[PDB]
Amino acid sequence: SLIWKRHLTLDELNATSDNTMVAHLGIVYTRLGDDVLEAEMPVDTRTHQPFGLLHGGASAALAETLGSMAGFMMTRDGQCVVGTELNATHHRPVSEGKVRGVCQPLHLGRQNQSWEIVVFDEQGRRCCTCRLGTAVLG
Amino acid sequence: SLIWKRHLTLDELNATSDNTMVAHLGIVYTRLGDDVLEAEMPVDTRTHQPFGLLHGGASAALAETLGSMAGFMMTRDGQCVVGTELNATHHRPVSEGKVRGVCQPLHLGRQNQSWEIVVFDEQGRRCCTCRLGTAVLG
């Protein structure tokens, strides 16, 4: 079932990243279903931590990016959304290729929402589990 | 697939609650699958907050109870687990009847573990989403 209130295309979605942290990290929206939003991010110099692994901060940023956008797509003209609470558990390390974030809703209220964001490595293994709470300012 | 390393019956599981907070709140283990554990808890004077609704602290207690026991059945003679990090998002209110918590693994490590616990009201509606990290000692 389609849940989105705002109907946009991937090209339009990616156009919002221009000149923001999203583009600075190479995050690209890659899939938009009826009730799910996906984006991929590279594991290189821009998202690395000392030893060469994926920085725990990059995964967090990817999650915050997806939850905010999905939340936005659930609002109507004149409304706005803002990320209020974030938590994340780092299960496994990643050192090469790209990771893929999958965002799905857990609760959709008219005043606030809760989104799940699981991050997988190119082998399909879950490397990070996050949850983001948002507030609608509409 | 069977994940448990300790094999116990629901009868044995409930017997461990004697003289603990689990029994004090009337929590009962109600289902044990290959890779899942469930328990139910009453929504009454024992678990209410001053305004007559289910106390968020009770939902949190049900979750820590579930993740801890599942963590325990994941260890062998001599070893032990301990809850280290817990978070919870309260989505919807409940005031009567009972709630049901469903616990499943997110990550099973030789040293760490991460468990998902979702709590539903009698209508099958999600009322709270939690995640508990646990450490395995030995």
Report the amino acid identity of residue B25.
Answer: L
User: Looking at chain A, which residue has its C-alpha nearest residue B134?
Assistant: A89
Tell me the residue type at B70: A
- Judge whether A87 is closer than 8 Å to chain B, CB to CB: yes
User: Using a CB cutoff of 8 Å and minimum separation of 24, what contacts does B21-26 make?
Assistant: B21/B61, B21/B65, B22/B65, B25/B58, B25/B61, B25/B62
Asked if the Cβ–Cβ distance from A85 to B89 is below 8 Å, we say yes
Query: Annotated binding residues of B, as ranges?
Result: 49, 55-56, 83, 90-93
Distances (CA, A) of B68 to B42, B56, B108, B116: 20, 18, 13, 11
Is B85 designated active site? no
Q: What is the DSSP string of B25-53?
A: TT-EEEEE-SS-EEEEEE-STTTB-TTSS
CB atoms closer than 10 angstroms to residue B78: 7
Residue extents of the structural domains in chain A: 1-138
- A83 in a known ligand binding site: yes
Is residue B21 a contact partner of residue B64, using CB atoms and an 8 Å limit? no
Instruction: Please name the method used to determine this structure.
Output: X-ray
Catalytic entry in B40, B64, B96, B122: B64
Nearest CA in chain B to A127: B107
B84 touches chain A (CB under 8 A): no
* Residue B67 near residue B115, CB atoms below 8 Å: yes
Please tell me the CATH code under which domain B1-138 is placed: 3.10.129.10
Give the resolution value in Å. 2.2
Task: Give chain A positions within 8 Å (CB) of B126.
Answer: 106-107
Test mutation, A110, A112, A127, A131, chain B, max B CBs within 10 A = A131
Q: Please classify residue A103 by burial: count the beta carbons closer than 10 Å to its beta carbon, then call 0-12 exposed, 13-18 middle and 19+ buried.
A: buried
Helix (H, G, I), strand (E, B) or coil at A126: strand
Q: What is the dihedral of CA B71, B77, B82, B83, to 10 degrees?
A: 10
